[PDB]
Design a protein around this nucleic acid. Structure first.
Lengths: 105, 97, 93, 87, 97, 78, 103, 95
DNA sequence: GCCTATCGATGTATATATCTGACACGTGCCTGGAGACTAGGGAGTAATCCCCTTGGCGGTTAAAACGCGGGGGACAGCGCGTACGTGCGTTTAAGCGGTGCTAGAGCTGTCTACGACCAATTGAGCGGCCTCGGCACCGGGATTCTGAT
DNA sequence: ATCAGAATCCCGGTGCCGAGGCCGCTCAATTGGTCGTAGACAGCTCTAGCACCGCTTAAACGCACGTACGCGCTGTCCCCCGCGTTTTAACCGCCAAGGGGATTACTCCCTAGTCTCCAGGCACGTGTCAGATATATACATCGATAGGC
């Protein structure tokens, strides 16, 4: 368990995050605890999106998450759609939505 | 004979295309248009196979959102047809000019 | 050439959340871009916050407050919790 | 006939059924007839902005080829971040 | 004598588009700011300039929203602005979910 | 005290916006919109203040929060 | 001073220092601050010229936030540049729709 | 007390250049200072991102030129670019 | 004037069958992360000064609030006629396979000017303090809008 | 088209405090020197972007007809608007605590920086399984028909 990610209990890297912070000119002295926190946050968000997209894949009888499933997961959820609202997912399409005025009677 | 009515086929088209990820503008004409829009800014310019595809994806995403706004402006005025006034309003409120 | 990506880490997270579900190369290319974008947003907010307080360091706290500012309410409240867990049991060892 | 062709202006190459298809993906039931030459102008203006920014990106790096990263950067400079095509 | 419905309204529009003052009253807005803030952290002091800046931003935002609302009202061939107009204007801007 | 934003004040705000005639239901909608706006802009000012070990919300915090939401304010400290 | 050497009134040295303490890049070139100061001076001159013209049209001899707002909103390019800015104590440009006016 | 800096004198010299007899109020002074700061940070962040994009670590005049071309509008990015090039040229001419 | 049986007209969804192309997994390698250690300054601490926000009082005015009449606009209904949808047959060009070339991306290696740091020096620039002229105002006339004659 | 008559313009006197100078001072910019990485510059490889033709085939185009949606008109109504009147609290002027922001100096630990060492991480090459894609089913959506009720 020599890796910092092992001590942090995260799958996302901590050394890579620290290197990116240092070489990104974000500040002149990156703290030792910042990479762990940021890696944990990114892992949390990735897990949230992936778990929401896999449910859509299951509902569509698919064993592979394609961009459609990611689009459905992000746009359906209110918080993710708020964070990723003004962002385009390539080959994601649009949410099915037809409005009451247009439907026939 | 069998004759569908104004708006009956349209709804099936909406359902079909809203369920698909396909790129609804054909690629070659859009590529040509991209190159000639790029040629006023700089001549002797080449494009990768993926740059034009990214441009097209962004373009139809923008246009689809704009048409959603245009339909909603049309319904605002007690209409089902989307008209150029609707697009102009839907682009004025968003600040684009 | 030599290129780096987050793909393997996203795939391990996938195996945790959904051990039986796979992912395509395009979905992975989208998830990697998502991770990078969120990284840049949080890091830039933290850097600006350090600049405001005449500081010169990005600590775990500045990341916490950038998370609070950026992420929505419920996502922010869960992300701060799990990040605090990670940092506290990292510093324990 | 076996002389030549019209050489259509290619902003017309974005044909009427293509614009109609885009509208139908947008949830539009009925469409006017004057909204095609307006959609063409809107699309053209959008492309001019994005392509000008991406050609500035390309020129700064001293390259003759417009990379996908240039397009992504140009879009992200305008609050239109594109996921999946680089970055 | 009396003025017809609308003329003094035009006079007020020509009057208030010509000035640069702050239209909302200062003290009620101050109280609103503090009661909103208390929900996040208890007993927060405020610099006078902080509330002044908040008021200026709020008035600017509300005036721009009312401009968009008026455009929406004119779209429907009406001179009255209605809550649906504000809803449409905030939505198109993306401010409303 | 959201009712403190009086009907004549909203009317003046509408007149400066070019509005000529206002429905009677506009006022509550405007008050709600203003409350959401203020909540959004103060939840960030209070965070910028909490991170600083300050109990006073300075004009700089408000300016930073407003700039963060795409609303740059000139003349109040920036 | 580099400001006189560059033929500018804006401070080249302070622009260099701010580019240096802002973490913008690890290294800052010699010509970057001069160019940035020149551009800033040009933009300031443009805004001040238009604002002073507006003040003269209003007979005011001192530019005030209202004149700055009028100058910025009357010029298309400056309005695009300052499009999401809210100049304090600036007001709104006079504009009433044709429909509202009586027939 | 503290020691604060502002772009208040240089703006006041530019004002004398454009309008020799016109003045500026304190609120307008602060507004112009905020404008200068905002433009500075915009054109510096754009240059920093451009340097990062090309695996670059130095912010030189070329990055500032291209950032002024990306950020500023069409006609306002021409006179500004010419002025910057002139300033750089005459600075490098003199020692 | 229903709306309810019912047609045969098309569309969608669901069923099993066989491919491929792209997705997992493994192998070898190397470049980046981990583990030592150092010096040094950035952040935390306590302590002091003093601005500055808070709450209180009183007065006075303006503004907000409530009530009224009425007229102008929102809204429902109706009719007309042109535009848009839908289907047919015919024609055009996109899509994908070729062909061939070569410009240009991307890598290494070189090396030398530009810049990063330090130290000593000096004057630009900031604040203290001061003053004089301009603008907000106040009230008085003329003026231009107007409002029913 | 016309008047009287509210409501902004126009003008002169007043006068208050903020903008515009002038000074003392310090700390930040400038000059001079040195050193080291970094970046323009030459060179070479070969990836992939450029044009074209060939061939298929589904989308696009052109045209006809019919229906329904848009737009103008009319009429009713109610709900806003503009004015008067009474009520409320915002504004301001002043004084006064005292809590908290900003400084100061001291001090210790955290982070950059260096070196060594090796194991995590992806390129490359791979086998096979999810999914594209079918055409078959079987079953709905939908005028159109014409029956009583």
């Amino acid at each position: 368990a020599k890796t910092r990610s092992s001590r942090a209990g995260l799958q996302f890297p901590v050394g890579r995050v620290h290197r990116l912070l240092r070489k990104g000119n974000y500040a002149e002295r990156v703290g030792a605890g910042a990479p762990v926190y940021l890696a944990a946050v990114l892992e949390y968000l990735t897990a949230e999106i992936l778990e929401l997209a896999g449910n859509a894949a299951r509902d569509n009888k698919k064993t592979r998450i394609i961009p459609r499933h990611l689009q459905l997961a992000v746009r359906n959820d209110e918080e993710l759609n708020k964070l990723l609202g003004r962002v385009t997912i390539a080959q994601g399409g649009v949410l099915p939505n037809i409005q009451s005025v247009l439907l026939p009677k | 004979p069998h004759r569908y009515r104004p708006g009956t086929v349209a709804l099936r088209e909406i359902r079909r295309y809203q369920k698909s990820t396909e790129l609804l503008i054909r690629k070659l004409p859009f590529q040509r248009l991209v190159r000639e829009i790029a040629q006023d800014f700089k001549t002797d310019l080449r494009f990768q196979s993926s740059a034009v595809m990214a441009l097209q994806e962004a373009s139809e995403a923008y246009l689809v959102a704009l048409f959603e706004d245009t339909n909603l402006c049309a319904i605002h005025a007690k209409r089902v047809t989307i008209m150029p006034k609707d697009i102009q309003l839907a682009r004025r409120i968003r600040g684009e000019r | 050439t030599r290129k780096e990506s987050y793909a393997i880490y996203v795939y391990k997270v996938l195996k945790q959340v959904h051990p039986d579900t796979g992912i395509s190369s395009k979905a992975m290319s989208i998830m990697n871009s998502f991770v990078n974008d969120v990284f840049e947003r949080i890091a830039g907010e933290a850097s600006r916050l350090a600049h405001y307080n005449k500081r010169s360091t990005i600590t775990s706290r500045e990341i916490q407050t950038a998370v609070r500012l950026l992420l929505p309410g419920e996502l922010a409240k869960h992300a701060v919790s799990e990040g605090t867990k990670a940092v506290t049991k990292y510093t324990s060892a | 006939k076996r002389h030549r062709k019209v050489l259509r202006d290619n902003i017309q190459g974005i044909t009427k059924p293509a614009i109609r298809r885009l509208a139908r993906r947008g949830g539009v039931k009925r469409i006017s007839g004057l909204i095609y030459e307006e959609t063409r102008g809107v699309l053209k203006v959008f492309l001019e902005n994005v392509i000008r920014d991406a050609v500035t990106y390309t020129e700064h790096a001293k390259r003759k080829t417009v990379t996908a990263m240039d397009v992504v950067y140009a879009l992200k400079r305008q609050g239109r971040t594109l996921y999946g095509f680089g970055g």
